[PDB]
Amino acid sequence: LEIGFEVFTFPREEEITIEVIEEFMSLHSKQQPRYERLMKMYKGDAAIFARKAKEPHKPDNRLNVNYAKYITDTFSGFFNGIPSKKNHKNDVVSDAINNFDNEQDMQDEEAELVKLACVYGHAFELMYQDEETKTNVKHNSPEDMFIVYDDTVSQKPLFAVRYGLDREGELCGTLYTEDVDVTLIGKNGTMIFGEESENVYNDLAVTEFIFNEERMGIYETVTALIDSYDKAISEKTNDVDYFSDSYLKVVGAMLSPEMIEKIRDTRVINVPEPPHDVSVDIGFLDKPDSDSQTENLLDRIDKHIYQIAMVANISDESFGSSSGVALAYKLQPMSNLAAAFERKFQAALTQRYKMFMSLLTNVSANLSNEWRGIEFRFTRNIPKNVLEEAQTAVQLATIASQETTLSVLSVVPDVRAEMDRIHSER
């Protein structure tokens, strides 16, 4: 099928009519099955369960080994294991940003956005004003929302749509534009604009987060290997069950079920009068157990699945042993992937915080254009040694400032609080 998503482009000048919106509805409905399959693969269901049944009495075993969940969870834990840190020079801006983050729980939202970006490929975020004049945010899956850009080289966002069936079975949705917001309602089957409300913000209220520039998932390129591995392991499991280990062969003599009633307790076999014309043969038949091709194939497939996906198999027995730096080397591709994703994530967060202080309620008009001063710090989740960090801080205290010295210490949650406490002490 299709292994990527292409952005929609619409000319700037012409008006946005219902027909264009409906055409985009058709285009997105065409693309939904890929998202459905990608979600179903992660959730636990597999394609092995859909295979045709076998003959009535032959054994049939279906085993699924879930790699997508492992990869997604490992990467999500690596990247967003420790919450990001945001700070500024001016006290008012930093105080407002920290208060907003505490009020709106940025940690869970960021974690869910990262997970959605990893699974589907891209995710959307919605921002709105509540009844008590406060700024709220939310995260949506890309199944119900799409965004359309203009055809200019700059490619700025133009409008976005969100829809869905209601309880009674008719389409209800909302249209977001730069200037106005419109509610879409339909009863007989058509769509008619219902109401318009002014946009307090200066831009679109929908932001797009992208894993890549082609909008591809982490495990989109390793589906065939997973399917083949599941098929091979299921076939081996089927082959193990059919036959026994050893058999007993008696040819030329009559044996009754009553005699073999106690075969474990009797260890002497006697044939007193064998037939003259034919020959009597007794012996054991063994099942041959020699498999070498399947093991090699499975090993190669298992190694390739982990290598190609750029995720390290930490718990492997052949992983790095008894070394300081050699262990850190094996985690390098995951660090590279995290650094690649951070480039988009930081820009998206900068856009969000640029949007945040636009309103006069949050900050004064003087400080509106100060979003350029925000600084972000990201830390990966790796094992850490406290003593080495303490010694490093002690050595750096000689030639570096207090803020830099306290920044290295992982024990310190906030440098400003510690400096305030030190000043209070003396």
Tokens for 201, please give them: 């913000």
Q: Could you give the CA distance from residue 134 to residue 397 in angstroms, rounded to a whole number?
A: 42
Nearer to its own copies, 4 or 33 (CB): 4
Nearer to its own copies, 148 or 390 (CB): 390
> Smallest distance from the beta carbon of 280 to its own copies, in angstroms?
6
Q: Could you give the CA distance from residue 73 to residue 129 in angstroms, rounded to a whole number?
A: 33
Query: Which residue(s) pair with 196 in the sheet?
Result: 182
Nearer to its own copies, 22 or 235 (CB): 235
> Smallest distance from the beta carbon of 294 to its own copies, in angstroms?
6
Nearer to its own copies, 36 or 190 (CB): 36
Nearer to its own copies, 108 or 190 (CB): 108
Nearer to its own copies, 30 or 138 (CB): 138
Tell me how many degrees the CA angle 196-197-203 measures, rounded to the nearest 5: 115
Nearer to its own copies, 198 or 289 (CB): 289
Nearer to its own copies, 179 or 273 (CB): 273
> Smallest distance from the beta carbon of 375 to its own copies, in angstroms?
8
Chain mean position to CA 186: 35
Q: Could you give the CA distance from residue 170 to residue 167 in angstroms, rounded to a whole number?
A: 8
What 339-345 contacts at long range (C-beta under 8 Å, 24+ apart), as own/partner pairs, is: 341/79, 341/117, 341/211, 342/79, 342/378, 344/209, 344/210, 344/211, 345/114, 345/209
| Residue whose C-alpha is closest to residue 136's, from 175, 109, 159, 156 | 109
> Smallest distance from the beta carbon of 30 to its own copies, in angstroms?
19
Nearer to its own copies, 190 or 410 (CB): 410
Please answer whether residues 65 and 230 qualify as being in contact, where contact means their C-beta atoms are separated by less than 8 angstroms.
yes
Residue 36 C-beta-side C-alpha neighbours within 13 Å: 6
Cα distance from N-terminal residue to C-terminal residue, the chain: 68
Q: What is the 8-class DSSP label of residue 284? A: E
| Residue whose C-alpha is closest to residue 118's, from 29, 207, 41, 18 | 41
> Smallest distance from the beta carbon of 119 to its own copies, in angstroms?
11
CA dihedral over 386, 389, 395, 397, signed as positive or negative:
negative
> Smallest distance from the beta carbon of 394 to its own copies, in angstroms?
6
> Smallest distance from the beta carbon of 252 to its own copies, in angstroms?
6
Strand order in the sheet with 192-198: 8-10, 145-150, 157-162, 172-176, 180-185, 192-198
Strand order in the sheet with 206-210: 135-140, 122-129, 206-210
Please answer whether residues 140 and 123 qualify as being in contact, where contact means their C-beta atoms are separated by less than 8 angstroms.
yes
> Smallest distance from the beta carbon of 186 to its own copies, in angstroms?
17
Q: What is the 8-class DSSP label of residue 362? A: T
Taking CA atoms, 59 is separated from 53, 56, 244, in Å, by: 10, 8, 14
> Smallest distance from the beta carbon of 221 to its own copies, in angstroms?
5
Nearer to its own copies, 284 or 365 (CB): 284
> Smallest distance from the beta carbon of 366 to its own copies, in angstroms?
19
